[PDB]
Design an enzyme around this catalytic site. Sequence first.
Site, PDB file in Angstrom:
ATOM      1  N   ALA A  13    -100.458 -19.380  29.019  1.00 27.22           N
ATOM      2  CA  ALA A  13    -101.801 -19.204  29.553  1.00 27.22           C
ATOM      3  C   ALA A  13    -102.782 -18.838  28.443  1.00 27.22           C
ATOM      4  O   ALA A  13    -102.392 -18.551  27.306  1.00 27.22           O
ATOM      5  CB  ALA A  13    -101.806 -18.126  30.634  1.00 27.22           C
ATOM      6  N   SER A  14    -104.072 -18.821  28.794  1.00 22.23           N
ATOM      7  CA  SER A  14    -105.135 -18.556  27.824  1.00 22.23           C
ATOM      8  C   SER A  14    -105.132 -17.129  27.286  1.00 22.23           C
ATOM      9  O   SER A  14    -105.754 -16.875  26.253  1.00 22.23           O
ATOM     10  CB  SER A  14    -106.502 -18.844  28.452  1.00 22.23           C
ATOM     11  OG  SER A  14    -107.549 -18.556  27.543  1.00 22.23           O
ATOM     12  N   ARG A  15    -104.398 -16.208  27.911  1.00 15.68           N
ATOM     13  CA  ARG A  15    -104.586 -14.777  27.703  1.00 15.68           C
ATOM     14  C   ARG A  15    -104.015 -14.257  26.388  1.00 15.68           C
ATOM     15  O   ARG A  15    -104.183 -13.079  26.059  1.00 15.68           O
ATOM     16  CB  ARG A  15    -103.951 -14.039  28.870  1.00 15.68           C
ATOM     17  CG  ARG A  15    -104.474 -14.563  30.184  1.00 15.68           C
ATOM     18  CD  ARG A  15    -103.649 -14.277  31.457  1.00 15.68           C
ATOM     19  NE  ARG A  15    -102.293 -14.820  31.509  1.00 15.68           N
ATOM     20  CZ  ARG A  15    -101.205 -14.255  30.998  1.00 15.68           C
ATOM     21  NH1 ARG A  15    -101.226 -13.030  30.500  1.00 15.68           N
ATOM     22  NH2 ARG A  15    -100.055 -14.921  31.031  1.00 15.68           N
ATOM     23  N   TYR A  16    -103.350 -15.124  25.629  1.00 17.09           N
ATOM     24  CA  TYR A  16    -102.745 -14.726  24.366  1.00 17.09           C
ATOM     25  C   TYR A  16    -103.174 -15.640  23.222  1.00 17.09           C
ATOM     26  O   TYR A  16    -102.641 -15.509  22.113  1.00 17.09           O
ATOM     27  CB  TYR A  16    -101.218 -14.746  24.499  1.00 17.09           C
ATOM     28  CG  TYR A  16    -100.595 -13.484  25.065  1.00 17.09           C
ATOM     29  CD1 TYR A  16    -100.642 -13.216  26.433  1.00 17.09           C
ATOM     30  CD2 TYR A  16     -99.927 -12.583  24.244  1.00 17.09           C
ATOM     31  CE1 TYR A  16    -100.057 -12.070  26.961  1.00 17.09           C
ATOM     32  CE2 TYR A  16     -99.330 -11.447  24.763  1.00 17.09           C
ATOM     33  CZ  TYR A  16     -99.405 -11.189  26.117  1.00 17.09           C
ATOM     34  OH  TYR A  16     -98.818 -10.049  26.621  1.00 17.09           O
ATOM     35  N   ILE A  17    -104.121 -16.551  23.450  1.00 20.66           N
ATOM     36  CA  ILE A  17    -104.347 -17.708  22.591  1.00 20.66           C
ATOM     37  C   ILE A  17    -105.740 -17.625  21.978  1.00 20.66           C
ATOM     38  O   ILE A  17    -106.733 -17.462  22.700  1.00 20.66           O
ATOM     39  CB  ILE A  17    -104.183 -19.021  23.385  1.00 20.66           C
ATOM     40  CG1 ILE A  17    -102.778 -19.120  23.992  1.00 20.66           C
ATOM     41  CG2 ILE A  17    -104.486 -20.233  22.515  1.00 20.66           C
ATOM     42  CD1 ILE A  17    -101.651 -19.122  22.977  1.00 20.66           C
TER      43      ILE A  17
END
Lengths: 50, 61
Positions: A13-17
């Site tokens: 998901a976007s939350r670590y990127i």
Amino acid sequence: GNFGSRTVQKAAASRYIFARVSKNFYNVYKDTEYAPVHQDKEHIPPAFYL
Amino acid sequence: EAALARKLAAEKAAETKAAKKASKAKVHKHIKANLCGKDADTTLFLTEGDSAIGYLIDVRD
DNA sequence: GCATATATATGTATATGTATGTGTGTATATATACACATATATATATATAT
DNA sequence: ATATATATATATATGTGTATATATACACACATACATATACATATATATGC
């Protein structure tokens, strides 16, 4: 961030990127103010780029 | 009612290879080591989150 | 006693026609299960007592 | 000798967090396969034929 490999295909998901523009963009895309402006007025990007 | 009980008795007693000790080998998400189950220094990693599964397989033992 | 012949049965090998993809992401939405605490509530279990 | 007064830990529940998952349409035009069957050749054999 974690982008996977050959062995895994589902991206996270976007939350670590974090992401940013690469240099290869600037190698092959240039002179972008001459891009053909799209026929819709609220289509704020053009038809395509250079 | 007798028909549905008959189908319960029909597809209840069927099938082969009734050796139920591991229906699934480890977990789908589990990385099974090659010397797992035997005497070695076989080490299990209990990470958190499946999005960490990237690069775990690649440079482990 | 021996030629023989053909019959059908089973390998076998291909060629049919289907059947299941999932592809590979886009797109739409939704669901899940835990830790952190007091505040009621409720409901039913026991005592007793005549 | 059981009706009832009463007491106390069950059930949400609030918000914050922290993480999962899932049914589908889209379509080529193949990809792999799922059996599959099926027709035909040939072998042997045995029982007829002589």
